[PDB]
Ligand binder design. Structure first.
Ligand SMILES: OCC1=C[C@H](N[C@H]2C[C@H](CO)[C@@H](O)[C@H](O)[C@H]2O)[C@H](O)[C@@H](O)[C@@H]1O
Length: 500
């Protein structure tokens, strides 16, 4: 499958640049009614004729795309899609089983979203859907060599935060070690993708998603194999590169795509100047969340191997995990500030900024106990707000920043804090975010993609597209949290005004 900019060449550029549709993702998801080569020969003939209408040419040649608890349960069918077969030349990639999409403009499965959605499904006893989704991701691993950002041809050149091993662990909570052993080959295969290029890597060098520091420490980074505009945000990325003539455009395209591989598209976290997206430099930053996830993946791989009966392999994975933990503790802790943070390959130091990503070492149990206590303090002091956990302390105009609260980060933070007995802060995050979700639901009768955490009752904003409704990981995380804040004796269908 070729991404639409390659498949439809000059025509794709021209349709996007003409802005025939208010969302750039629209034409990226359009299906050619006939062979692209034919539509392209045709376009070359007509395009310069008197009174040629581009829009008309496109219409002819393409097909274009109750309680809180009750509401979430009724949404699952609306968010479920089944696409075992796909039309010829569709950007949508086929999957063997039904899958849940986030909602709105997101009409395909997403990698990291699905873990948090599956948490909700698992909590509701929809273990069949959870099995189906693990199977879908295993299929993509075998088919593409890795999990794409989503099941679209324009997502094949990148991944997303790697939650597959955690999904397999989720499935094992129901099916036992049999699930770990079943999906071991695909977990190893995903690991080999993340580590591709390590062989022959020298100190001080990076290759694809692997970074080797000057002392030999191996860590990973986000990376996309392409350095061109994103088809799904074509005119935005061109405008971003055009606005900064002092950088090669390919470098800007690479970092835009890599921030998209990071899940945090976009954030002051990646930028020299928090008010200029054209300064982002994702590929020179070693992310603390990614490397926390890699640690977890290595720990899960060791467990699966040992269950499977392969002890030499289990010992290898445990040794790799032990080394990664030493790297996180050394390069991804900011000792001057007292919090985890990303590492800057440009300055050769730990970056200053506190973001919600700094909770990930707690989430995966990599963190030292004293650093976990320090993180509880940093969270209360800087990130915890009336409507939930702030993403950063910086209002950049981007969506992965203040004042936005994102469901997946609320879950990572509360689970992380609980892993170290920091129960008070963990409960405050859950209660604040849930109240926000409930309040917005009382107002709008919906769940949304992200929330403004400075108060409760309003959805968030920022970035290159409008606030989306649904919404997969909000619904999944909400159900999980709802079930935990109320006793099993008396479960709640709405978030209550009093803590029990
Ligand atoms: O809910 C799906 C998502 C959409 C958001 N990003 C997608 C939309 C971008 C176009 O607006 C796309 O380039 C990116 O790769 C996609 O993952 C969000 O920031 C992601 O963390 C999230 O997984």
């Amino acid at each position: 499958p070729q991404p639409p900019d390659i498949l439809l060449g000059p025509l794709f550029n021209d349709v996007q640049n003409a802005k025939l549709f208010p969302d750039q993702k629209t034409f990226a998801d359009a299906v050619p009614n006939s062979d692209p080569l034919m539509i392209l020969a045709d376009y070359r003939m007509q395009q310069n004729q008197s009174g040629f209408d581009l829009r008309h040419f496109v219409n002819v040649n393409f097909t274009l795309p109750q309680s809180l608890r009750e509401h979430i349960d009724g949404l699952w069918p609306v968010l479920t899609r089944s696409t075992e077969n796909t039309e010829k030349w569709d950007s949508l990639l086929p999957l063997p089983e039904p899958y849940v999409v986030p909602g709105g403009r997101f009409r395909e499965v997403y990698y990291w979203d699905s873990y948090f959605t599956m948490l909700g499904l698992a909590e509701s006893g929809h273990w069949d859907k959870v099995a189906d989704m693990v199977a879908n991701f295993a299929h993509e691993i075998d088919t593409y060599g890795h999990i794409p950002n989503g099941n679209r041809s324009y997502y094949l050149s990148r991944s997303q935060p790697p939650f597959f091993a955690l999904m397999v662990e989720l499935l094992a909570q129901h099916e036992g070690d049999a699930a770990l052993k079943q999906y071991l080959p695909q977990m190893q295969k995903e690991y080999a993708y993340w580590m591709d290029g390590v062989e022959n890597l020298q100190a001080g060098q990076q290759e694809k998603r692997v970074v080797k520091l000057q002392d030999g420490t191996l860590l990973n980074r986000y990376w996309d194999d392409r350095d061109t505009p994103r088809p799904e945000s074509w005119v935005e990325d061109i405008a971003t590169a055009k606005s900064n003539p002092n950088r090669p455009a390919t470098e800007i395209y690479r970092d835009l795509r890599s921030a998209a591989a990071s899940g945090w598209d976009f954030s002051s976290r990646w930028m020299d100047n928090p008010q200029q997206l054209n300064t982002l430099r994702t590929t020179s930053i070693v992310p603390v969340d990614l490397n926390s996830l890699m640690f977890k993946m290595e720990k899960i791989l060791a467990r699966a191997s040992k269950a499977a009966g392969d002890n030499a392999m289990a010992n290898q994975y445990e040794t790799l995990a032990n080394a990664r933990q030493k790297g996180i503790e050394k390069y991804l802790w900011n000792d001057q500030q007292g919090w985890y943070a990303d590492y800057d390959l440009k300055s050769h130091k730990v970056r200053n900024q506190l973001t919600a990503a700094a909770l990930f070492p707690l989430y995966v149990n990599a963190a030292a106990k004293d650093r976990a206590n320090k993180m509880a303090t940093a969270t209360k002091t800087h990130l915890l707000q009336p409507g939930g956990l702030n993403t950063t302390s910086v209002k950049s105009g981007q969506q992965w920043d203040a004042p936005n609260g994102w469901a997946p980060l609320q879950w990572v933070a509360t689970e992380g804090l609980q892993n170290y007995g920091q129960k008070e802060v963990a409960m405050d995050i859950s209660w604040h975010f849930l109240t926000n979700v409930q309040h917005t639901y009382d107002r709008e009768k919906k769940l949304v993609e992200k929330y403004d955490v400075s108060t409760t009752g309003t959805g968030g904003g920022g970035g290159e597209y409008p606030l989306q409704d649904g919404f997969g990981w909000t619904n999944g995380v909400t159900l999980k949290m709802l079930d935990l804040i109320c006793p099993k004796e008396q479960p709640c269908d709405n978030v209550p005004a009093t803590r029990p």
